[model samples]
Target: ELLPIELDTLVGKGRFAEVYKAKLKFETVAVKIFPYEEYASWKTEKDIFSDINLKHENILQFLTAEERKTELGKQYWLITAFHAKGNLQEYLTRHVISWEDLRKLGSSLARGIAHLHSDHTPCGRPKMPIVHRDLKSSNILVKNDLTCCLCDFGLSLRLDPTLSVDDLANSGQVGTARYMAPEVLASAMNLENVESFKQTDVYSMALVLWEMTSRCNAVGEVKDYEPPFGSKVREHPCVASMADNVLADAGRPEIPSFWLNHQGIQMVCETLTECWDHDPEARLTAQCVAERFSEL
Candidate 1:
């Protein structure tokens, strides 16, 4: 039988799982509970975490994954290291951080994404190019020191080496609509182009950068936290509206003029512009972005 743990508080709920703050052997941890109906999510996450040498400081730590039976039903529980500060979206909404904190968060965030995309394997196993289909602020957790950690690999895709890159078909356009790339919104992306997937992630990362910079108190007072295109879209933005605004109209999130007042923020804005460019090929790689953040 698996070890017993006590649930403390409800952390958050996703489409496939309910997360909770829990106590296991006197240590605080986060537990993601997936009901029987959403077994695929549990399996997918487990597979990703099980990858050879996938561990990284900026990636959420995966501990134990098991199935438990209760009177209600069978559930899949995934245990991981807990961060009291919660996800990046929650932290940014509640408090404004300094430029240093922003830099730390951005650099770590980019590094984590870059790590996932790169093949670290020397010879044992070929490096798998993983695409984080769902990259957003809420999917990024914040540590006590304000560093960002990437999480939620349920929708991630691992390119199959055996299949020709051109043979990969559309995966039905998964991911948060608001953060989707223009090619994704239009449903015109070339799935065969493996680089297309990474570029789409870069586009989303640009939106995340927009969120972080908007909350930084570096130069002027921090503005209220808003999701990407909050002013342009509805409270709950639909896929069609996003497609129209992002694809048809070729619109982007508003960049505050005040961003130019701060050198660091201005540079970040410039980077974001490149990341979200209409031409996906023009987007910067996550590693490139990490290098830029390191310079800042």
Candidate 2:
């Protein structure tokens, strides 16, 4: 058994919550505790994770949950198999891995996600199409062997099979603004289109691939370049700055100029750009992006 206190000190803190690294019954584990809140989105993520269960080399393992309450308030914990190597975001800082390695690992990550997009469950339960609302480098994890796993479910959602694409577009929920698909931002698109959601994830995955290859925040530019990595004034942007204008009109995590000339890189760029196109209907599906990666 693992104790709550032990976890707090181990995984430490992340952008949304505190993660604790621990071992239970000799098995490594990561315990993430969420803040006290009434947000419907949080509940949505919890429901999605709890609804699906499968094993993939590039996806985090969901172990169990720990619910607790302190004198001050209450907290909910999600326990997962610990990836000793931690998230991909931190690993990128240590040293830039090669493009081939990044692509292979990126493919593995896609497989894990594709696993979720398909109809299967470890418990033999009915299939539920899941959409990862937040797909970013930080959410990607890597083990010592170089396998990558995707994490962070705070923005995930479970989609109903019966809903029409138009009905789905109404789902106002969005992921990281930078990785969001153009259709997701448009009021015309409904969230019901599972294909669109999957494509949006693919768009984000492609951007992540760009980051792995470049060893930089794919969201920002390192030197002078066209269509910069992402908006500069992100944290505290002016009401109407260049970044803001670009986001409102052009849409996110701009394409890197370096990849513009090569065919493979162009395909990846086109995939992301289409996904970010002001119209949601134009985005490519996860299956399509995966195939594109395979071709490279």
Check candidate 1 and list the clashing pairs. none
RMSD of candidate 2 to the truth, in angstroms, is 4.9
* lDDT (tens digit, per residue) of candidate 1 on 4-62: 78999999999999999999973899999999999999999988887656788888998
Give one digit per residue, the lDDT tens place, for model 2 in 36-137: 773343354455556536455566767666567778797777777777777776777675565466556666776777877876665566677777878877
Candidate lDDT (C-alpha), each: 0.87, 0.62
Worst 10 residues of 2 by lDDT: 219-228
Q: Which stretches of candidate 2 lie over 4 Å from their true place?
A: 1-5, 8-16, 25-27, 36-53, 119-126, 161-173, 216-231, 236-282
RMSD (CA, angstroms), candidate 1: 2.0
lDDT of 2 at 61: 69
Candidates in order, TM-scores: namely 0.94, 0.74
